[PDB]
Design a protein around this ligand. Structure first.
Ligand SMILES: *[C@@H]1O[C@H](F)[C@@H](O)[C@H](O)[C@H]1O
Ligand SMILES: [Cl-]
Ligand SMILES: [Cl-]
Ligand SMILES: [Cl-]
Ligand SMILES: [Cl-]
Ligand code: NI
Length: 944
């Protein structure tokens, strides 16, 4: 009873005679890429046009189809897929006959359970399982906030949130990755949503007596009520600002005035054995203790809570002591958990989605992780070049309040000769009762074009905040609405925002290009006309009303152009940013646009956008977590990424003192100054080594000169790392060029460059910044050193001192306040330029080429005009650098390419580092051999 085979031009289509899956289509997408579509029906046409994939089946890719017995082989020069004619399961082999990925079953289709709205009869909950009992690593998946780099054996929920951005591209430690092309909420590992604490556990209160947990309510230190609760849950608002479950009547007042405190106490007993996951979702100060030990200490701003996870081994029957402390300060809280899966699934690959019409994924083969990302780029679109100024320093604030305030702070950087390219105008520049009109309050921003012109005249660019949000009072709302493009259920719910008495508001519907075209014409007419340089597309999750349930959030986007809110929950930002990008293209066909946006999904990089992690807090745990967040995003195939240096929201201890509202650090209560300055110093260090370097957030003010005084150690350290960023621009912008021309990745998990080192795989507090720099952020208050693992098979130089160390060891790296531990890989060729104040100053600049000896090297410096689209017609250049360590020779090869404004002649000096040197970072004054390069190859011998 074998399956029937139909040879298509793109591959094959099996018609299985058994089971739920009726048809199984394979499509050759490229030399290294095969699409798999498992359909519970006969009409593939029911499958929605991809939002991620812009790639269509290849036409010029040789492939062969051989059939024998009960196995079908379809292969290219690089990938081999063996399908069973019995059950329809696919097995992927490399070009040398090794099992990369094997499907377990044909996939589990279930009824949709998480769509609050009416469900298409041909929609299902999807699940697919692969590689049971593997030992492989798993990476990518997007920007997540639980410290995971190697996801293997654990859970990730690919939902969309302020702080979370799912990109369903999974990369293995083996030579493949895959794109799971589903727009709805998706889960890695455990299929189930994390449940209430009492759904897979037995609960005992303080009295030891079975039941629920002991829930004490405190006002101040005064106990005001004790009682036992099953599922303690104040996770969401139902409407407006009203909790879903209100607080006991007798402390309800304390909640609203921040005097409320709470404790939970009891014992948990799992009925099953194995690894359990736990999630403490919260705002305010929360602290969880288990077995007498603290497991979680977290604070998050009240309006932006999130989950804090940890796994732990449990034996059934075993009771364990649980203690929790929650000072809500008006925030939220729930406690969730999941018991272990069936043991045979304990170590498998599992992806599930909430709604879809078919299991649809793309197998991507690649000999290196860069090769694998490259497949992702080809499916979902090339990461289009950002303007060169985007890799310079960005200064933002929530918020500047006038044209004057912006020009003043920019001028202050220039006066202090501290480099900066970009300043940002955040929300609330419009008349307060016209959010969405895109007008400029005449009191504070009387002449926008003059303000942009003053920024430009100071050789900076300016970016501006634009939401998908409209008040129904405004004409722009009315215009979108008459075409049916407004999501109106938030108006019905009467959900007012947080501005003034509070306004009625709705978000538009970007899932139709007729809609995004209007959105774009609106901002074109109102904002673009004054010459702003970039768009800060905030709130694109969307976050229509903060803190409603995710079902409400789903419900609110129904109906959109693509069905329900649930069917497209992760995808909002792509079409939204696409419209802005496409309009800009239509407007100026020779200027690079830039978008910064707070959400994404597969393909976002095709809109010339960078993403950031949104509203993180000014905590150390958060800074640390940002490392895994950026890693996971780059390894998901989206490299242009950043965060708010210093965190979006500090605690109250920082925002407000005895001297009132804290702007400058001078207004801080004395006892806080130290941590505010150290947290910012450490974060600026980290910031200069992520793809985009950007300071932003709520008060205190975040300019370097508002964090500390001139001359102080911390001021000088922050200025030093900013300068270093610009010294490094020839290196950095090369990475920038590479994102497009070489499908490159800037912020690299260690698996990309040391894939054969299992111990590197798991590391979540270090990463490669480009090919040369091993970056190791200090993430602990008052730490003056940190463990650093030096990966095996390479030697390493201390960037600051020149000391050479061997890899394959962990060291205790010196980390004084002023320096983040930084190491260069033996063989790096690092180009630097002169000190500059903004990127254009350094065009055609003199170069210092620094060769870190001990291994061969290779680095081709990428240059172009930095602003135009001419690079797409070939207007760019590469200056090839090649180092041979045996002969000790650096070859500066023949220049490749050319572009308008490129200097034919370049002054280049070359130096070699081989050990300790006082000039390790003294770029201007270092001894080095000088060369007048004219595009012709020239060799420089290392000194004897
Ligand atoms: C969206 O809201 C504001 F506009 C901005 O300051 C914040 O950083 C972002 O989350
Ligand atoms: Cl200038
Ligand atoms: Cl200048
Ligand atoms: Cl200048
Ligand atoms: Cl200048
Ligand atoms: Ni200048």
């Amino acid at each position: 009873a074998l399956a029937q085979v139909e040879r298509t031009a793109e591959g094959v289509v099996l018609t299985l005679p058994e089971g739920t899956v009726k048809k199984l289509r394979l499509q050759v997408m490229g030399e290294r890429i095969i699409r798999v579509t498992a359909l519970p029906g006969t009409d593939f046409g029911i499958v929605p046009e991809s939002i991620q994939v812009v790639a269509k089946p290849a036409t010029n890719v040789p492939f062969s189809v051989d059939q024998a017995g009960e196995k079908l082989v379809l292969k290219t020069s690089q990938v081999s897929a063996e399908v069973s004619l019995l059950d329809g399961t696919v097995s992927f082999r490399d070009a040398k006959g090794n099992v990369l990925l094997q499907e377990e079953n044909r996939g589990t289709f279930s009824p949709v359970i998480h769509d609050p709205d009416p469900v298409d009869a041909d929609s299902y909950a999807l699940r697919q399982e692969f590689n049971r009992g593997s030992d492989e690593g798993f990476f990518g998946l997007g920007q997540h906030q639980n410290g995971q780099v190697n996801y293997a054996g654990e859970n990730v929920e690919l939902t969309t949130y302020n702080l979370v951005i799912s990109i369903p591209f999974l990369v293995s430690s083996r030579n493949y990755g895959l794109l799971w092309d589903n727009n709805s909420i998706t889960r890695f590992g455990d299929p189930r949503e994390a449940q209430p604490l009492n759904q897979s556990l037995k609960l005992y209160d303080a009295e030891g007596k079975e039941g629920g947990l002991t829930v004490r309510y405190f006002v101040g230190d005064e106990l005001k009520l004790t009682r036992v609760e099953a599922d303690f849950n104040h996770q969401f608002y139902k409407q407006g600002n009203e909790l879903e479950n209100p607080f006991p009547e007798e402390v309800a007042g304390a909640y609203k005035n921040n005097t409320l405190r709470i404790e939970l106490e009891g014992s948990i007993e799992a009925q099953a054995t194995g690894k359990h996951q736990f999630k403490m979702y919260n705002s305010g100060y929360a602290q969880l203790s288990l077995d007498g030990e603290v497991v979680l200490d977290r604070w998050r701003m009240n309006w932006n809570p999130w989950y804090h996870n940890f796994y732990r081994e449990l034996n059934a029957g075993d009771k364990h002591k649980l203690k929790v402390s929650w000072k809500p300060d008006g925030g939220f809280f729930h406690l969730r958990h999941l018991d272990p899966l069936p043991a045979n699934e304990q170590h498998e690959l599992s992806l599930a989605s909430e709604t879809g019409k078919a299991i649809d994924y793309y197998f991507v083969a690649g000999d290196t992780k860069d090769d694998i990302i490259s497949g992702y780029r080809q499916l979902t679109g090339k990461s289009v070049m950002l303007p060169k100024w985007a890799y310079g320093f960005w200064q933002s604030r929530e918020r500047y309040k006038s044209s004057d305030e912006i020009i003043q702070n920019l001028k202050e950087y220039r006066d202090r000769k501290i480099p900066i390219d970009n300043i940002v105008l955040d929300w609330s520049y419009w008349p307060e009762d016209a959010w969405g009109s895109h007008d400029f309050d005449k009191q504070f921003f009387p002449d926008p074009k003059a303000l942009v012109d003053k920024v430009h005249a100071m050789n900076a660019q300016i970016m501006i905040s634009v939401w998908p949000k409209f008040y129904p009072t405004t004409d722009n709302y009315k215009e979108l609405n008459a075409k049916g493009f407004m999501f109106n259920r938030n108006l019905d719910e009467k959900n007012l925002d947080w501005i003034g008495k509070g306004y009625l508001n709705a978000f538009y519907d970007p899932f139709s290009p007729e809609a995004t075209a209007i959105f774009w014409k609106q901002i074109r007419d109102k904002i673009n006309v004054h010459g702003f340089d970039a768009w800060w597309l905030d709130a694109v999750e969307p976050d229509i009303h903060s803190n409603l349930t995710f079902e409400k959030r789903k419900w609110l986007m129904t109906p959109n152009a693509r069905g329900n809110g649930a069917e497209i929950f992760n995808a909002y930002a792509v079409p939204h940013a696409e419209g802005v990008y496409q309009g800009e293209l239509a407007t100026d066909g020779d200027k690079r646009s830039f978008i910064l946006t707070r959400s994404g999904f597969g393909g976002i990089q095709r809109t010339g956008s960078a993403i950031w992690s949104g509203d993180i807090v000014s905590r150390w745990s958060d800074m640390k977590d940002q490392i895994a967040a950026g890693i996971g995003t780059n390894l998901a195939g989206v490299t242009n990424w950043t965060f708010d240096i210093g965190g979006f929201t500090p605690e109250d201890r920082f925002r407000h003192g005895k001297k009132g509202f804290v702007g400058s650090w001078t207004a801080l209560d004395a006892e806080q100054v130290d941590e505010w300055q150290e947290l910012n110093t450490r974060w600026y260090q980290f910031g200069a080594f992520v793809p985009l370097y950007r300071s932003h957030g709520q008060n205190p003010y975040r300019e370097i000169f508002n964090i500390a005084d001139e001359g102080t150690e911390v001021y000088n350290a922050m200025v030093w790392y900013t300068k270093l960023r610009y010294y490094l621009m020839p290196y950095i912008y090369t990475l920038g060029g590479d994102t497009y021309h070489k499908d490159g990745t800037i912020m690299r998990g260690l698996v990309m460059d040391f894939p054969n080192d299992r111990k590197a795989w798991d590391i979540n507090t270090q990463y490669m910044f480009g090919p040369a720099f091993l970056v190791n952020p200090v993430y602990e208050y008052k730490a003056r050193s940190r463990d650093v693992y030096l990966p095996a098979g390479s030697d390493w130089y201390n960037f600051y001192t020149g000391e050479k160390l061997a890899g394959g060891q962990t060291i205790t790296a010196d980390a004084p306040l002023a320096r983040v531990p930084l190491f260069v890989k033996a063989g790096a060729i690092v180009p630097t330029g002169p000190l500059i104040q903004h990127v254009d100053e350094g065009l055609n600049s003199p170069l210092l080429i620094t060769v870190y000896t001990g291994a061969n090297g290779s680095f081709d410096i990428y240059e172009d005009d930095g602003r135009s689209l001419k690079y797409q017609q070939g207007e760019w250049s590469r200056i090839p650098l090649s180092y041979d360590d045996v002969t000790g020779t650096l070859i500066i090869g023949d220049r490749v390419g050319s572009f308008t404004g490129m200097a034919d002649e370049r002054n280049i000096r070359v130096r070699f580092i081989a050990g300790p040197t006082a000039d390790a970072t003294n770029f201007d004054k270092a001894a080095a051999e000088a060369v007048t390069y004219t595009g012709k190859s020239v060799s420089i011998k290392r000194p004897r």
